[PDB]
């Protein structure tokens, strides 16, 4: 029998999901009291690290 | 004892009779359907004899 072929189109679900927190923390100005630790719960995302 | 019925007229009838003579000649891609197209399950699968 005959057949097989290869090109790779993996077109993505997502098209513009919001980033993260990131690139907010790794570059904020002003970081929180030591003890009062700035833990937030990061945003929905693409945290495509 | 002595008593016999002959006909006088007739009657042409035509009647149909249908017969099925072939059926539809399929084939199959032993693999493709097993393995689906694209498959190292398909190199398991020579194991099957």
């Known amino acids: 029998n005959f057949r097989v072929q290869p090109t790779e189109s993996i077109v993505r679900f997502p098209n513009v999901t919001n980033l993260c927190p990131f690139h907010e923390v ?5 970081f929180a009291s030591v003890y009062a630790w700035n833990r937030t719960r990061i945003s929905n995302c693409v945290a495509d690290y | 004892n002595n008593s016999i019925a ?36 398909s190199n398991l699968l020579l194991q099957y004899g």
């Not at chain 2, 009657?11 to 190292?40: A, F």
């Open chain 2, 6 to 41: 002959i006909p006088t007229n007739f009657t042409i009838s035509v009647t149909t009779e249908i017969l099925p003579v072939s059926m539809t000649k399929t084939s199959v891609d032993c693999t493709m359907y097993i393995c689906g197209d694209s498959t190292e399950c």
């Open chain 1, 26 to 30: 790794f570059n904020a100005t002003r």
